[PDB]
Design a binder for this molecule. Structure first.
Ligand code: CL
Lengths: 233, 234
């Protein structure tokens, strides 16, 4: 029975998790860092070992991972980064709070964007402060013209995240390698949705705790044997 | 030039302070080691360096140096490749001993001979050595063959296992135009410098790279330096 571990990063700087931090490359706040420390410690005490790690190309996730590997004394592990495990690209909404968002786009569009699974937010306009910051960052230089997102619904994020899981992670697991994924709420959501066969409703309703190792026991077809387990107290 | 290549030796380890031979022992940085790496990274930032891929050992002093540099230059998103082939030289039975214990046990003559020879290994690290299980039974070396797993290395041995990796994994990256950063150890780096500059065995033993300092090569189409290595900092 394969063991799989996930972990969502915690709090980002300047309250950005509550401001559609999206593809903006926010660092952890000291608190989010400490949360990663607790997660690390929990993993250390349970005596978990991994053989390979996956993460996004966003620094908050990466730092969460570094913190974990440090805590569990497994810094020598192979690590693979990918935009495919990135947070949702919240487009034009990026950096904005609820109020700012509604003021810019109206209550209607806004509540639609909240309640939906497959309706994207509007894309970054040239006057948006994160415009070139994100869309011209060389970390996405390899992406095709039709592959570089400008805005993503939950469904989009999940769609660009699933093939990486399929092509890159699933092979490691079948070979018996113990996998740690350090990522983001929505991409992790992609994975959990695939694993437990949840509906759109269900997935939008689920909030994965931050900073806490999430454990899965998987059968030979990679299907969960139990509900997800948390490590700590 | 034609290609830019940056090397950096890990900052001061906790054992470097105690003057203990580490070799394949996984000693962590000292706080001063950390600040050394931080400074190196700050220097790499102030000069505007951008990388595309990173190579390092499977030893946390090198790895931590790397992390600190990538934090400093804001490039934590870069691909990072670890290999034991860039590990510190395996110091065999001297592992865990200090210079005093070493002198006391073997004599000053012999220790000299050791650190002045390119081709002579230290005594092997045998199964009753205090660090045998720590190093040899470490799961991070599980995929090594019997032949590949040292009980000890001369510089020539270390170099011999480091270069195939350079040839097979790093050279292809450089010739593709990828800007490469290698965060490793004095002796494995020595392997790389000796190859680049074609130094003699004699004129590589005398070569001492400091902890924590970015080293720059500008190479050409033959991956040969156009100019001598530049140190980076204040
Ligand atoms: Cl890494």
């Amino acid at each position: 029975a394969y063991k799989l571990v996930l972990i969502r990063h915690g709090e980002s700087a300047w309250n950005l998790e509550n401001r559609f931090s999206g593809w903006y490359d926010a660092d952890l706040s000291p608190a989010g860092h400490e949360e990663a420390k607790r997660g690390g410690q929990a993993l250390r005490d349970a005596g978990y070992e991994f053989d390979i790690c996956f993460t996004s190309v966003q620094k908050r996730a990466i730092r969460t991972l570094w913190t974990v590997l440090d805590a569990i004394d497994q810094m020598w592990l192979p690590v693979v980064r990918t935009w495919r495990l990135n947070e949702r690209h919240y487009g034009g909404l990026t950096g904005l709070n609820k109020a700012e968002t509604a003021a810019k786009h109206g209550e209607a569009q806004v509540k639609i964007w909240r309640r939906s699974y497959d309706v994207p937010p509007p894309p970054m306009e040239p006057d948006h402060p994160f415009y070139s910051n994100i869309s011209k960052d060389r970390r996405y230089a390899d992406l095709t013209e039709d592959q570089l997102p400008s805005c993503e619904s939950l469904k989009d994020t999940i769609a660009r995240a699933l093939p990486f899981w399929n092509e890159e992670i699933v092979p490691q697991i079948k070979e018996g390698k113990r996998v740690l994924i350090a990522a983001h709420g929505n991409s992790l959501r992609g994975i959990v949705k695939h694993l437990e066969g949840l509906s759109e409703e269900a997935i939008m309703e689920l909030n994965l705790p931050t900073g806490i190792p999430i454990v899965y026991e998987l059968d030979k077809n990679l299907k969960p044997i139990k509900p997800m387990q948390f490590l700590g107290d």
